[PDB]
Design a protein around this ligand. Structure first.
Ligand SMILES: CCC[C@@]1(CCc2ccccc2)CC(O)=C([C@H](CC)c2cccc(NS(=O)(=O)c3ccc(C(F)(F)F)cn3)c2)C(=O)O1
Lengths: 99, 99
């Protein structure tokens, strides 16, 4: 679709068999979800943004679907204030910024 | 322009007659810049990032040229990993998300 930015660009995403609301964030290098269960192996890492750093669990090769678009990539899990879809996954659904 | 997301959406901006780099960030409600001088009076604001909360200084009606487009709006100044253009100015330059 074409999404205006008058409000936060929140979308429904299918991940780990659940439906969840997530923010489309062009400034995020990576994708971070609040605490949730995901399959497979993970490692602890540290990511930073406004307000500093948080420790998160890195899961690789995770399937996502955003508005009918399927993708696969790394998904992080930890104490983010909300679920955020970052560029590693926005590219895969063919998301661009236009003006 | 159409900006893809394989790299960080960093653009050159002109603020206070100076050239600076800033991130185009649809995940940010607001625009925040690293410590700098801006004209006029300021008000106190607290904002959340993925790392937690920071206190910032809020300046109104600040002229900023973003990738050659003029915007005049609210600019926050505080401790940030980098300069961030949020939705308040992304909307002024006519930016949408497309996929
Ligand atoms: C001005 C605050 C902006 C924002 C708001 C989050 C929010 C939204 C609604 C409610 C509450 C909070 C969105 C955002 O993109 C980031 C940063 C990038 C600037 C962010 C987001 C997601 C992940 C990261 N970590 S990272 O390792 O993937 C990373 C590290 C650095 C950068 C860099 F480009 F900013 F340097 C981008 N990404 C950072 C953030 O920390 O908070």
């Amino acid at each position: 679709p074409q999404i205006t930015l008058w409000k936060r660009p929140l979308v429904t995403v299918k991940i780990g068999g659940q439906l969840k609301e997530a923010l489309l964030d062009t400034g995020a290098d990576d994708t971070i979800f609040e605490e949730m269960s995901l399959p497979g192996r993970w490692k602890p890492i540290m990511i930073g943004g406004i307000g500093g750093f948080i420790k998160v669990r890195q899961y690789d090769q995770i399937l996502i679907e955003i508005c009918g678009h399927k993708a696969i990539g790394t998904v992080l899990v930890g104490p983010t204030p909300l679920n955020v879809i970052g560029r590693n996954l926005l590219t895969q659904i063919g998301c661009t910024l236009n003006f």
